[PDB]
Design a binder for this molecule. Structure first.
Ligand code: Z7H
Length: 253
């Protein structure tokens, strides 16, 4: 199964699907690198209530997840899997894909991230009350930024983050294994062709992405225990379904 010409066709198909479903083009994020939050704007964010900052972040993550769902729908073989398997994969990998895509909005020179039109450091998120999680996200983004990923590398890498045949709950495991294997060949083929196989040993262990998503679910539970009505009344329905049935509807479009 799958010859060399079919693997190269898969490479281009994945890259195209990724370009079409980017929340912001890479150049839009680079051109904004000198637009940094002033000391006064940072204090403004710090002084916001914990629940207002949590609602803002849950709204931005929901928007980013919506682009990830669209990327999955454009991925060759994804819409062919059963609906149970599509939902199992999006439920475990959607936040993981948002976290890898986050490195494009991260500036390693000054340790800032793009958020609401400008760049700011970790201290912008102090009001969330989950400094360890933000810190882990910034470290993960910094570690990814040290690899100097091209857009095509991110497309192939995030396709593999999403198409994981080890997710518990998968009914047609072999069908996901075949698609994962084809995407692995496409990723390794593209790395070999462009003299970039050296990044393979430097890719983060799979347990690191799982650790960030687990910390996110735990910090959300702490916040939801303190503010149940805020989550119920002001958090996006899709965010609550993933982390706290919108997905079936999003998938049928
Ligand atoms: C996994 O959990 C979390 C993850 C992140 C987080 O705060 C953010 C958010 Cl919401 C957005 C951005 N940047 C962006 O969304 C910037 C962006 C915009 C458009 C295209 N690419 C990137 C940066 C950060 Cl650090 C908080 C939590 C939890 C604590 C709620």
């Amino acid at each position: 199964m799958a010859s060399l010409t079919e693997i190269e066709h898969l490479v281009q198909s994945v890259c195209k699907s990724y370009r079409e479903t980017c929340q912001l083009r890479l150049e839009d994020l680079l051109r904004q690198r000198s637009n940094i939050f002033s000391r006064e704007e940072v204090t403004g964010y710090q002084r916001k209530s914990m629940w207002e900052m949590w609602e803002r972040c849950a709204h931005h993550l929901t928007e980013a997840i919506q682009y990830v769902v669209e990327f999955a729908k454009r991925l060759s073989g994804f819409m062919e899997l059963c609906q149970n398997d599509q939902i199992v994969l999006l439920k475990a990998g959607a936040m993981e894909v948002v976290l890898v895509r986050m490195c494009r909005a991260y500036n390693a020179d000054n340790r800032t991230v793009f958020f609401e039109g400008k760049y700011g450091g970790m201290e912008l998120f102090r009001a969330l009350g989950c400094s360890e999680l933000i810190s882990s996200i910034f470290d993960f983004s910094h570690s990814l930024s040290a690899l100097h990923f091209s857009e095509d590398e991110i497309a192939l890498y995030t396709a593999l983050v999403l198409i994981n045949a080890h997710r518990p709950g998968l009914q047609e495991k072999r069908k996901v294994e075949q698609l994962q294997y084809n995407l692995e060949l496409a990723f390794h083929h593209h790395l070999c062709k462009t003299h970039r196989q050296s990044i393979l040993a430097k890719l983060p262990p799979k347990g690191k992405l799982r650790s960030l998503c687990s910390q996110h679910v735990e910090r959300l539970q702490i916040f939801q225990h303190l503010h149940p009505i805020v989550v119920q009344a002001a958090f996006p329905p899709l965010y609550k379904e993933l982390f706290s049935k919108i997905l079936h509807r999003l998938l049928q479009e």
